[PDB]
Amino acid sequence: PEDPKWEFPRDKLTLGKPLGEGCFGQVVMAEAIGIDKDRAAKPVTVAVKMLKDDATDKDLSDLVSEMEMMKMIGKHKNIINLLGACTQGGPLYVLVEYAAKGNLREFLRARRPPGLDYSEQLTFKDLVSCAYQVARGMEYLASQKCIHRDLAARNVLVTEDNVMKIADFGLARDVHNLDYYKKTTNGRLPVKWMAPEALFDRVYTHQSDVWSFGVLLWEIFTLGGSPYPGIPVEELFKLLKEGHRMDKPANCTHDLYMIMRECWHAAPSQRPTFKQLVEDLDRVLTVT
Numbered sequence: 001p002e003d004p005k006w007e008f009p010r011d012k013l014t015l016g017k018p019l020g021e022g023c024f025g026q027v028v029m030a031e032a033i034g035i036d037k038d039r040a041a042k043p044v045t046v047a048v049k050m051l052k053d054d055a056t057d058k059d060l061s062d063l064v065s066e067m068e069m070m071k072m073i074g075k076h077k078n079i080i081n082l083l084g085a086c087t088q089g090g091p092l093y094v095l096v097e098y099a100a101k102g103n104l105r106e107f108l109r110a111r112r113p114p115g116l117d118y119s120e121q122l123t124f125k126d127l128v129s130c131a132y133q134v135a136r137g138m139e140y141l142a143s144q145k146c147i148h149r150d151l152a153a154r155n156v157l158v159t160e161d162n163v164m165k166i167a168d169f170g171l172a173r174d175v176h177n178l179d180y181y182k183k184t185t186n187g188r189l190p191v192k193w194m195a196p197e198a199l200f201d202r203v204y205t206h207q208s209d210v211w212s213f214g215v216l217l218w219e220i221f222t223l224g225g226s227p228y229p230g231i232p233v234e235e236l237f238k239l240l241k242e243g244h245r246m247d248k249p250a251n252c253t254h255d256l257y258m259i260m261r262e263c264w265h266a267a268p269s270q271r272p273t274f275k276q277l278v279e280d281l282d283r284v285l286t287v288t
């Protein structure tokens with residue numbers, strides 16, 4: 001179906017360097033002339049998401065659904081914003097703000113301290129800021145009655161300005177009706193970030209995102225450490241069922257570990273909301 005307000009003209013888009021690929025599509029850098037509705041003759045660098053080379057009918061419907069998930073949500077500073085879409089006469093191209101500095105996982109990894117033997121930095125305060133930014137975006141997201149379901153450092157992107165922008169509405173779900181989502185189906189899932197109720201019982205909520213945010217905290221304060229490294233899905237299950245929790249990172253203050261562990265209550269309803277997480281991180285950002 002047509003949507004003239006988002007429609008963007010093919011002849012104004014030059015596809016550029018590939019960036020990598022997600023689940024439903026691949027991403028390239030691109031030049032889009034006058035994307036900056038305003039002024040106007042100037043080419044803006046954007047990201048373009050399009051079908052992969054081996055794409056199924058489902059990938060197409062998922063990519064459209066992801067596009068829609070974005071049109072719904074609305075604009076927020078801490079969310080990757082939709083910019084437009086070539087949907088007519090040629091492949092689907094979805095046009096989206098470019099984050100120059102890549103995803104957060106590699107961002108953090110890239111600025112680990114090298115050796116003294118090997119070859120700005122980042123402060124503790126920088127790390128809490130990232131946590132906060134993501135908390136704010138998830139807060140906005142939740143209030144738009146939508147669930148992320150894929151929240152992880154690799155799914156936050158960083159602008160030239162070091163602004164965190166949540167991305168990958170691949171598994172994102174409009175929840176306006178019920179205020180939760182139930183899977184009942186089978187597919188490929190980000191298991192090491194997933195709350196027990198979501199993993200074992202297929203129930204998703206803003207509260208299962210909160211558990212995941214927990215894991216993103218761990219990722220931030222380890223500077224892109226991998227949760228449960230090498231441990232196979234067989235064994236994650238085992239560890240969760242026993243109520244294992246990840247250890248406190250060296251760089252983590254006690255305060256922040258409490259926020260972390262709080263996100264990992266067994267009972268969903270005992271976890272803070274994103275609203276509270278914003279509050280808690282604001283405070284901690286404040287005392288630093």
Ligand SMILES: CCNS(=O)(=O)c1ccccc1Nc1nc(Nc2ccc(N3CCC(N4CCN(C)CC4)CC3)c(OC)c2)ncc1CCc1cc(OC)cc(OC)c1
Pocket residue numbers: 019020021022023025027047048049066067070080094096097098099100101102103154155157166167168169170
């Ligand atoms: C994960 C899922 N995200 S994705 O979008 O599928 C996706 C997967 C892979 C790559 C990029 C993306 N996407 C985006 N990437 C950027 N900037 C970026 C810059 C640099 C790198 N680098 C550069 C360094 C790096 N080196 C290269 C050489 N190598 C040898 C060593 C390492 C490789 C990665 C980068 O990779 C992260 C990313 N900006 C925006 C997006 C669009 C986001 C989006 C689109 C959308 O359209 C519907 C809907 C959304 O929310 C619904 C969100």
